[PDB]
Amino acid sequence: ASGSALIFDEEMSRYKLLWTDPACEIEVPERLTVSYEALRTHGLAQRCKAVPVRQATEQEILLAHSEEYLEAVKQTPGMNVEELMAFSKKYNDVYFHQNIYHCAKLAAGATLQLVDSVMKREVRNGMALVRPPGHHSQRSAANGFCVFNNVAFAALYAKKNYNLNRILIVDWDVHHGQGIQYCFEEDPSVLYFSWHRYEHQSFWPNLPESDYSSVGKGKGSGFNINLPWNKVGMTNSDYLAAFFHVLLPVAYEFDPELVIVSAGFDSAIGDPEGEMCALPEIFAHLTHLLMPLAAGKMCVVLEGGYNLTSLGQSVCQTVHSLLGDPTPRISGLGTACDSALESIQNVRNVQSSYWSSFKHLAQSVRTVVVPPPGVELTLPKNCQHSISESTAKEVQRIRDKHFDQNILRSLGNIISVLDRMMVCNGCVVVSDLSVSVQCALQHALTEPAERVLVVYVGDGELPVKTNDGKVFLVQICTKETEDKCVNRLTLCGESLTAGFMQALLGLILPVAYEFNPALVLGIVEETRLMRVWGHMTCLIQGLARGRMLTLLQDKDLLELTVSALSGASISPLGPAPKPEDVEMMEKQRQRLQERWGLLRCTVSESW
């Protein structure tokens, strides 16, 4: 798997609302032209394999629609304006054009082309700049601004033409995709997640099925997840707490073979129909947190977004992470608001009967590797290798100051890898630890690095303190090591490669994102349990703009380390840990949700 696909055609911009209708005036053809021109300006569309648009055959349109309804819209190109707005009134909040039936077939055919490109390994992922939208249309009705359900096409299409059993659909538009839910209501093959502006049913489409109540029907119960926003103005911490505490936990245990997203960017600050406060760069992290799933095979499909002057900002942030570009640091993170915590609390409980990890107790080169000198590995063409008189004087300065061996090559490289990163990231095999870890961050704290995230697996204490607020330590052991300092975290069978994940999504990732570090420092000791380190290394790349320095003490582990630093696809894990292991997590979630509010998944108890 190599590039990334971008499907688009100017022809889908040649149909518009031809009368006065305040319901659909926000839906204009200029949404599609500004999104491509934004990708063109920032030097993004030129970096993606442009797959041409095809039409969707009526053999494919009947996968999710009835013949009675397809023949009804097939007669629209011959209707005049008087006849068109009469046909548009038989449906709710939608308009039709002389060219809309032609563009809607291009709408489905665009996503299907994206599905084929991603599933044939032609590309690693992709995005479809497409109009009209999709997730409102049902089996025999047009609704919202949509005619045919674009990503519901893709799901049954991928279910049919590729024999895939587990497809994850994410709908981060803030309108409920009721067409998706209806299509796969009784279907456990397709897991549909959807957050949306609800306001206690006050907001369109005003459906009871949009509430967290609806989990599914029949054998498909458990694979429909609705997270209703009950107040407007949700921020980045609200959106990320959602991912960390409901979507990502069940996604990795769902272990999807293909992830499809309903990209709606009215969830961003400035959109008149969404009225939310999330910055455009939050979408760079939404996609990134979904890349370890399905080995990266992710097909983004456009839905909503109406602030023309800011819609292009988030479509580029989506493509930026799609190409693997460094994600921007998110500052100002904290606790989700009380209503967001109320919604995340409710659906976590209603879904707890299926995803049991929700139960509660009663109340251009971007990496550099310096491996043990003399080794030669096969590196994916975006890596390099090794000091200098500028650097050696610093190593000599530190040599007699605080501390002979060949570890002075460990240090000379460790200094120059950090000088080079402040290239994106790196990784170094190290001799003795304490001198390597000490020289690493002590040289990093003066790089300058405002704050330094530190992740270390192994036992015993590492050689640095967490007194001030410029450092935070993550550690996974075999012993208890009950800590008291809040700027730290110590954690801990065959359940290790399965319980560590939900401890990374539910605990490690939330505190780090609030920490907003300038540099991540990964350390492991020789001691292994390797089936998971690649999944970890991938998701922290969302912090510190990707700058992470890994220190292995080396085994075959190095080959998998650099795999995620370089941006390659990440191996799936396959689909529940120990009870004493999650008692370990909430014993430190209650301890840490004081300082770091992003760990909270319930509304605070008032004193």
Ligand SMILES: NCCCNCCCCCC(O)(O)C(F)(F)F
């Ligand atoms: N202010 C009045 C508008 C009321 N009609 C609701 C519009 C539905 C929005 C559709 C959408 O944004 O969800 C899509 F992604 F499909 F494009």
Ligand SMILES: [K+]
């Ligand atoms: K939605």
Ligand SMILES: [K+]
């Ligand atoms: K479902």
Ligand SMILES: [Zn+2]
């Ligand atoms: Zn929308």
